[PDB]
Amino acid sequence: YTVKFQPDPIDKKGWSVIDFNNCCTQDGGWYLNMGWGVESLIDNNPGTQWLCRWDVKEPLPYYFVFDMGKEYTLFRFGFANPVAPAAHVWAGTSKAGYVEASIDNENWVKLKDWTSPKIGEPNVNMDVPATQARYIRFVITDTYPTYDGLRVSLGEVYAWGLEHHHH
Template sequence: MKKKSIIKILMLGGAILMASSCKETVMLPEQDEASYNQVYMPQSVNGTVSKTLDVKDGDQSFVYGANFGGMGYPENDIRVRFSVDNALVNTYNTLNNTNYEPLPDGAYQLSATESVIPKGSLSTSPFKISVKTTGSNAIKMFRNYLLPVSVSADFKINEKLKTTYFLISSQPNQADYPDYGRSAWKVVDFSSQEANGEGANNGRAIFVLDNNIQSFWHSQWQGASPGPPHYITVDMGKVITLHGVNFTARQVDGAGGKPQDVRIETSMDNINWKPAAQFTLNAVRNQQKKWLTDFVDARYVKFVILSSYSSSSVHLAEFGAY
């Protein structure tokens, strides 16, 4: 029995030695590490960079820069340059079926157009693109602008990541624009109203200014039922700057008769009118605020209802502005 055990141990040891001797040493070819080393813009890694800025005094900014990618660290300083080529906006629009405008030259500034990725480092310092949202040369509110910033260098460039496309827009902060008081406002014209059929405290155009969301204006339906466009003209008592308007629908269930497509017009004299905005409202009860395309000074404002949900008539609880 003892002899058999010794034989088994010897056989197992031999098998292990044979397995070890059969294992090959794998030799990998030499790698050209330098071919992996490239300069790129890290902001471009995730595609288009969207920036929505507040409309306020003072420039607003965001970051750009260049990185070294590859094996190890650069053995020498790498000089890089940043530039904007608006011809790339057209290329981007064609490829993506968009219609963005180039960011106007006077509306922005690059804090640096040249820099260095230092020897032994992986990036330049972070730089800033400053954009104006107010004052001369400021970007227009609610418009989308495209700014393509590209990096170049006396070094290999990652062609897929050399340009960052910044999609820039601006909009006001709603909290900075409270609703105007309406105590001096008067309805001076309207397309029609239901003066009888809705009761003593409903139906007439004046009820869009009574601070009561339970009352409402309704276009005429008794004796006649005119279709759209429906409108009400309001004299605000003095010239004010209109930034936007608000609507509160009649407080009933269902969409039928709630305003859908609306146009805003403004005037200084109630004779000459200019379009200020056009938009679509939702069929909901709560107040809806809508910005004008541009801020405008006016004494008179007219809201024109071009269509209503599921009806040719219309009703509305409150109208205001901010």
């Protein structure tokens, strides 16, 4: 928990979801042309979204392993529920979960345990203990129920931190 620093999120261009366990793209390729895949989570804006598996409601937890490309020292981490013209703003139901961090994609260390107060919550950032990392692991553990049961869509994930020596 740090004071009002307000720097700017790491440019997620070298980024790339290197691993996940749930998306709508798993099924028919027609979902593919919809831009609802995991990569739709680190493309700079919450305008594009990510959709869970829809043909078969999969039980939680859902996780993702982002590869920031290089090493950093995370200060904060957060995400942002979907936002118009996102086809599923009512689906952003992330309620509880946590985020881990690793430097070799083998050994991980917990950073924090986030919790969103309502469905489709604008942004949810958390102060994460000053830790060195290359890979991040986001995990949704509980979801707010919907008119159509357990559904969930994510807008985007942000990460702050210093960049280690270019070397």
